[PDB]
Design a protein around this ligand. Structure first.
Ligand SMILES: [Mg+2]
Ligand SMILES: [Mg+2]
Ligand SMILES: [Mg+2]
Ligand SMILES: [Mg+2]
Ligand SMILES: [Mg+2]
Ligand SMILES: [Mg+2]
Ligand SMILES: [Mg+2]
Ligand SMILES: [Mg+2]
Ligand SMILES: [Mg+2]
Ligand SMILES: [Mg+2]
Ligand SMILES: [Mg+2]
Ligand SMILES: [Mg+2]
Ligand SMILES: [Mg+2]
Ligand SMILES: [Mg+2]
Ligand SMILES: [Mg+2]
Ligand SMILES: [Mg+2]
Ligand SMILES: [Mg+2]
Ligand SMILES: [Mg+2]
Ligand SMILES: [Mg+2]
Ligand SMILES: [Mg+2]
Ligand SMILES: [Mg+2]
Ligand SMILES: [Mg+2]
Ligand SMILES: [Mg+2]
Ligand SMILES: [Mg+2]
Ligand SMILES: [Mg+2]
Ligand SMILES: [Mg+2]
Ligand SMILES: [Mg+2]
Ligand SMILES: [Mg+2]
Ligand SMILES: [Mg+2]
Ligand SMILES: [Mg+2]
Ligand SMILES: [Mg+2]
Ligand SMILES: [Mg+2]
Ligand SMILES: [Mg+2]
Ligand SMILES: [Mg+2]
Ligand SMILES: [Mg+2]
Ligand SMILES: [Mg+2]
Ligand SMILES: [Mg+2]
Ligand SMILES: [Mg+2]
Ligand SMILES: [Mg+2]
Ligand SMILES: [Mg+2]
Ligand SMILES: [Mg+2]
Ligand SMILES: [Mg+2]
Ligand SMILES: [Mg+2]
Ligand SMILES: [Mg+2]
Ligand SMILES: [Mg+2]
Ligand SMILES: [Mg+2]
Ligand SMILES: [Mg+2]
Ligand SMILES: [Mg+2]
Ligand SMILES: [Mg+2]
Lengths: 129, 123
RNA sequence: UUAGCUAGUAGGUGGGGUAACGGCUCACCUAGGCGACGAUCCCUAGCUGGUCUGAGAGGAUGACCAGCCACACUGGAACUGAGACACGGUCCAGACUCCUACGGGAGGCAGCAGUGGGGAAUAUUGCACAAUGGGCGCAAGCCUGAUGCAGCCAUGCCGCGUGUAUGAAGAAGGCCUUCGGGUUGUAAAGUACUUUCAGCGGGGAGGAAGGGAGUAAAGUUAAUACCUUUGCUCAUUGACGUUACCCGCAGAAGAAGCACCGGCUAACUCCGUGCCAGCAGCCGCGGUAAUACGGAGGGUGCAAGCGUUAAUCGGAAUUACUGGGCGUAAAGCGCACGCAGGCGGUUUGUUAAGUCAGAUGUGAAAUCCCCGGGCUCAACCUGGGAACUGCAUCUGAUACUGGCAAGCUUGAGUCUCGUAGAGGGGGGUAGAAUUCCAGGUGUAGCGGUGAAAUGCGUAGAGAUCUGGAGGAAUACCGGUGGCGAAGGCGGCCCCCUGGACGAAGACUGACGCUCAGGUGCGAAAGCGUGGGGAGCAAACAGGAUUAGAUACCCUGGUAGUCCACGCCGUAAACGAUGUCGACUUGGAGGUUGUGCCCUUGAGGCGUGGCUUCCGGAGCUAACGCGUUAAGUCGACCGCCUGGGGAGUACGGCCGCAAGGUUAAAACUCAAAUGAAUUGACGGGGGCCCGCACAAGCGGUGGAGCAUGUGGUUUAAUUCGAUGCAA
RNA sequence: AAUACGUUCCCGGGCCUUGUACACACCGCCCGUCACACCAUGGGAGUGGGUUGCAAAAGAAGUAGGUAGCUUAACCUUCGGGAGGGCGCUUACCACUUUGUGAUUCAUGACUGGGGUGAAGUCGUAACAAGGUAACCGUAGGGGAACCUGCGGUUGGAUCA
RNA sequence: GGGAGAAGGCACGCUGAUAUGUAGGUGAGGUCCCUCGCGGAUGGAGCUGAAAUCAGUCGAAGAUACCAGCUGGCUGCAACU
C-alpha cells in the first residue's frame, strides 16, 4: 500500500523530471508542502501550489537548465522502515555542500545548512543535488 | 535484505575451516612413524614420492611428506611435522621437518640448506 | 535438531533473623510469578580499562600493566575476629603422599626459586632490604621471594659495531663466451689511516630521603628536665657494582649469515639429470637448449638475523549497518487465508516516550593522539593537553514517529442493476468410434514390419450390412481464445455455489498492506477398502533386431489409467520472475464491459477490465526486460553466500507404505557456473558446384600370364611407401 | 563414337544459417557398474567413560533448638544448696555415600552401507549434434552398469520441408 | 489396546484429640398440608459409621498368623483364546 507518501513525492518529482515533464501533481499534505517550500527556496523547482480544500492536490512546477533537469539526484533517507535522526554536530552535507539535505526539526522543515546554523538536529528526510 | 530481517537474524560470518587440524594450532607436532613408504601423484605428474604415516602426540594419525632427495626414516622413527600440503598428493597436508629429532638433514645440500636441515659446510 | 518453566514457587499477614532492606526463615492466607522482547534446558566462558587489525563502520581478542570478581588439593562446615566462611588457620569426609620402634603420627607450591610429568615451547634451588611500599615497635630496629636488582633465552623493540680512504689494463682463481672478450671487481693484494664495541689498566656521578650523637631556640611545665618541632655542626648508611660516564694501552685487529632470482615478484646463465631424482603459497615445472629439479658463477632482497610453520585482522563490497544479491550464474516457499509482528492515507487539538537543544554530574589511572621535558640518539621514561564519540538527571523545543481524543473521504469495504467465462460440486442426457456378443452376405486370407515372425482365420476370419451390451473420452466450434490463488478446468441440459468486471449514485469511515509460526488447497505416479474395466499400458510372456539387446519395433498383456470414500503432499508445481501500492514516451492486434453519433452500412468519437506481438528511455554480464518492468520508488515476507559431499546422515514431527519435511559435519578439489564470441563438428537446414549422380560407351571383379603388396617360407628372401592421398 | 531431361539419391567441396556440454576441435567430449589402493564418514550385537532427571536410603563435623543423666573457680546463699555454664543425649539442616530406573554426550566395535580421491584396468555408450529412441523433472516398476519402460509436466528441444 | 502389578519407593498396630463417634448411611417424636394414605412436606431425636491429620505409645518385627505375584535382559517357534 501507500505507506510512504514522501518517497512517493520524491519519486514523482524524479520520474517526471527524468520524463522532461513541465509539472507534477500529487495528493497534498503539510509535510509535502513544507518540503516543496525548501525545494523552491533552494531553487530546485520553479514554484508550487495546492488546489482544493477537502481533497487538496499539490502541484510542483519543475525546472530545467541546459535542456537538463535541475534535480540531478533526489533520494529518500529516513523512511517508515528505518527512521534516521541526526544531531546538530552530526548533520550530513550532500556533495560537500553543493547539494542539500532536508531536515525536520522542532522548528519545522529546513536544509542541513539552516538547521546547522540554528543549532538543531532532526529527522533526515532526503538528499537533493 | 530487509532491516527487519537482519534485526531478526543478524549477519553471521562463516567460521574458517582449517587445512591442518592435526596441528591443533601448534607450529609443529611430534609423532611416531607408523608406515614409511612411497606413493604416486595425480594428473599430470608422475613419480615415487616419499611419505610417511605418523601417529602424533595428540592421537591424530596423518600422512606427512618427506621432502628432499634421500632420507633415512623407518617405522618407529620419531619425527617433527609442520603444516604444508603436497598438491599432487591428495590427502597429504603436512611436511616432515628435515633435520629434527630422528629425521636427518638432506645429504650434500648447498642451496636452501635451512629448509632441509643441513649444517653450513666447513669451507 | 531445547517451548514451555516454577511449592519458598509469586505476593500478603505475623513471629523469628541480619550490621542492614528482603521468602532471609517459619506459620497462616491469597494463587500467583517467569516465558517467543527467548523463559526452561543444553554448549561455551571470568568481566572491564584496553590489545591487534581496519580509512572508517566493523572483525578478532582479554599475557605482560591497572580495576572488579572468583578460587587456595576435592566436597562440606563453621570458630576467632572490625573484617574470613581464611593462600602458607581450625573441624569432618574424599583422593593422595611422607614418618614409625607398628601401637600411632604428619602434610597440601595456582607465593619465589627448583623437580617429575605433559608439550613444538617458556629461565636461577642467585643478591639485598640500599631505594619505594607493607606488618609490628615511642624508637632503635626486626620481618618482607612485595619490591629493587642480578643470572638464563636473539623472544621482541631500539641503538651500534663487524672498519675508513686510496688502490687497474682491471692480477691469479672461478664463471660465461660466438675465443675477440665480458664478469666477479676497487672487490682482493698493496698504500696510508681511524680504534666505537669487545679486551686491558686508571679514575669516578646519581638512585640518600633519612637515622645517630651532640648543640641552640620555641611550644611544655614548678622547672634550663623529658617530650616534640625546626635550624647547626661532627661521623655515618648502595644489593645492583668491576654501575652510568670520563681518560689511557694494543692492533683491523675478535665480530656475517639467511632466503630468494618462471609469472604474480626485485634478481639469468652454464653444467648435471631426463615424467626420474625432485620442486610447488597460487598458476604450474621435470621425456635431451629446464632462467621452475640439484650444483655452480652471477644477481636480488633482508641483515644479527633470515627463512619455514602456526595464529588474528586486512585486502574480502567474500554476511554487504556504513556496503551485495535471487528470469537464464548460488538464491521467490507449488498456491492461497491468516494470528503475533513490522509498516500505514489526511485534518485539528493534546501529550512529550522516540527525536532535538542546553545545563550539570560521571565516564579511575595507564594506553592511543598533540606540544613539550629527560637518558649521547632511539627504543624507554616523563609534564600538560586533547580524547574517552558513552551513560544518567534536570530544563526546554514539538517538525517528524509513538500515545490520546474528535474527525475527514481519496485507500478498503457494503448496496443496486447488468455482462462474459472449460471457475467449483451434484444429477441427467447425447452422438461418433473402438472392443465384445448375436445374426445375413461372402471366401481365403487378415494383421504387422524397414523386412519379418509371433498372433488371428475354413469351429468361416478380415471385408460388408443389421441388431444389442459395455466402458472411456468428448471431433467440428477452437483461437499467442476464456476462467481460476496455484494445481489445473472443454459435448449438451438443469440444480447448488465462488470469483472477476462495468455503469450510476448512496452508505460505512483508514475498517488498510504484508505475514515467521498455524491452517487449508495442491498434476501425475503411488497406497487402503469396495466397485468398474472398452481403449491404452509399467510389470511379465512370446516374436524380431543386434557382437550382445534385460531396450528401441511387433503380437499379447497385469497393476494402473475410470467411480466412491480415505491416504500421500511431491514435479522443469515455470514467467525458472513473492505480495501490495505510486510513478515514468509509443505502434499494431486479440478478448470482454460501457457513454455518445443522420443506429440509416458489417461503422464514426470516447472510456474501463484482461491479453498477445514489437519497441523508447532506463536497466542488464550479456541474452534480453521494457506501463502485465527485469525501469523509477516505498511496505512486509521467503531465500542465497565456491564445486563435489547433500537436500545426504543424526535427531524431531508426519505417513499403512513409498516416502515427505526440517537439516548438518568430516573429507576432497581450484575450480564449478552464466551469457556471448571465433572456429570445428552434427546420422540440422537452405542455396550452389565437380564424370558426383543421372544419360551413355568401354571396362575391373571370373580365366591365363606381367607386376606390386600382404602373408607364408628362408641363412637371406635388403631398406622405405599402407584409407581416399601405399 | 554414344549420351546428358535433370540435381531427388551416393561421394568430395563452397557460401549462408542453426544446435553444441567439442577447442590436440567427433579419431572430440563424457556416464555408471565392476577390479585394485588410500581418506573421512553413517549404520551396527555391543564395550568403556563424562554429565544429568526422578524415586527413595544415608547422616561425619558444625551451628541452632530441646534437655531427665553427669559435671562446675568468678555471681547469689539462710553455707544445705541455687542461678548460669560445660559434657553427654536428642531433634532440624546438610557433605560423603547407597539403591532402583530413565535421559543425554564422548570414545570405541566384528561387520556393513553409501561417499570422495587416484597414471594407467574390464564392460558397455547413457548425456552433449535431432547424440542417432529429443532431453530433463516428479513418480512407479524392471534390468550387470550407465539406464529402459509407463503416467503426467517443462522447453532449458533440432527440423518444419 | 497394550507392554504394566513393568521396575522401584513410602505408609500400615495401639491410644487420645479434631469429634466423649467425624464425612456419610438410616430416620422417630413434633408442626403443617392433603385428591386421607402403606401419602407428601417440614423436622432432626435415636441408631449406625469408614477414612484423614496431629499428638502419644509397646515390641526385634503392625499386609505380624492362615492367606498371598519372584523380577529383569537376548533369542527359536506358533499370531492370539
Ligand atoms: Mg516480616
Ligand atoms: Mg573455563
Ligand atoms: Mg605475574
Ligand atoms: Mg609471571
Ligand atoms: Mg590485572
Ligand atoms: Mg573450602
Ligand atoms: Mg563474630
Ligand atoms: Mg574472598
Ligand atoms: Mg602453599
Ligand atoms: Mg617432554
Ligand atoms: Mg680471467
Ligand atoms: Mg670497552
Ligand atoms: Mg649517593
Ligand atoms: Mg622480474
Ligand atoms: Mg625453491
Ligand atoms: Mg639442460
Ligand atoms: Mg596466515
Ligand atoms: Mg568485511
Ligand atoms: Mg553478489
Ligand atoms: Mg525464456
Ligand atoms: Mg538457479
Ligand atoms: Mg512463484
Ligand atoms: Mg501546547
Ligand atoms: Mg631528547
Ligand atoms: Mg604521557
Ligand atoms: Mg595529564
Ligand atoms: Mg582515562
Ligand atoms: Mg500525532
Ligand atoms: Mg457402438
Ligand atoms: Mg460521516
Ligand atoms: Mg486404487
Ligand atoms: Mg507393447
Ligand atoms: Mg496394488
Ligand atoms: Mg521442491
Ligand atoms: Mg520487447
Ligand atoms: Mg535499448
Ligand atoms: Mg561447499
Ligand atoms: Mg531426506
Ligand atoms: Mg546456451
Ligand atoms: Mg553412371
Ligand atoms: Mg583377374
Ligand atoms: Mg553433400
Ligand atoms: Mg560409528
Ligand atoms: Mg548415445
Ligand atoms: Mg538419445
Ligand atoms: Mg514421457
Ligand atoms: Mg504418629
Ligand atoms: Mg537357534
Ligand atoms: Mg499356539
Amino acid at each position: 500500500s501507500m505507506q510512504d507518501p514522501i518517497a512517493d513525492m520524491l519519486t514523482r518529482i524524479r520520474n517526471g523530471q527524468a520524463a522532461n515533464k513541465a509539472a507534477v501533481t500529487m495528493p497534498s499534505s503539510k509535510l509535502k508542502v513544507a518540503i516543496a517550500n525548501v525545494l523552491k527556496e533552494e531553487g530546485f523547482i520553479e514554484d508550487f501550489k495546492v488546489e482544493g480544500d477537502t481533497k487538496p492536490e499539490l502541484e510542483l512546477t519543475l525546472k530545467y537548465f541546459q535542456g537538463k533537469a535541475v534535480v540531478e539526484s533526489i533520494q529518500r533517507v529516513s523512511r517508515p522502515g528505518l527512521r534516521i535522526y541526526k544531531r546538530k554536530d552530526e548533520l550530513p552535507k550532500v556533495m560537500a555542500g553543493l547539494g542539500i539535505a532536508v531536515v525536520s526539526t522542532s522548528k519545522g522543515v529546513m536544509t542541513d545548512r539552516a538547521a546547522r546554523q540554528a543549532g538543531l538536529g532532526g529527522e533526515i528526510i532526503c538528499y537533493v543535488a | 535484505a530487509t532491516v527487519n530481517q537482519l534485526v531478526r537474524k543478524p549477519r553471521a560470518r562463516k567460521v574458517a575451516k582449517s587445512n591442518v587440524p592435526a596441528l591443533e594450532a601448534c607450529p609443529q607436532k611430534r609423532g611416531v612413524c607408523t608406515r614409511v613408504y612411497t606413493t604416486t601423484p595425480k594428473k599430470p605428474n608422475s613419480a615415487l614420492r616419499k611419505v610417511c604415516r605418523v601417529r602424533l602426540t595428540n592421537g591424530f594419525e596423518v600422512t606427512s611428506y618427506i621432502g628432499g632427495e634421500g632420507h633415512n626414516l623407518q617405522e618407529h622413527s620419531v619425527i617433527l611435522i609442520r603444516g604444508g600440503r603436497v598438491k599432487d598428493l591428495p590427502g597429504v597436508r603436512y611436511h616432515t621437518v628435515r633435520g629434527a629429532l630422528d629425521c636427518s638433514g638432506v645429504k650434500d645440500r648447498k642451496q636452501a640448506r635451512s629448509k632441509y636441515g643441513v649444517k653450513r659446510p666447513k669451507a
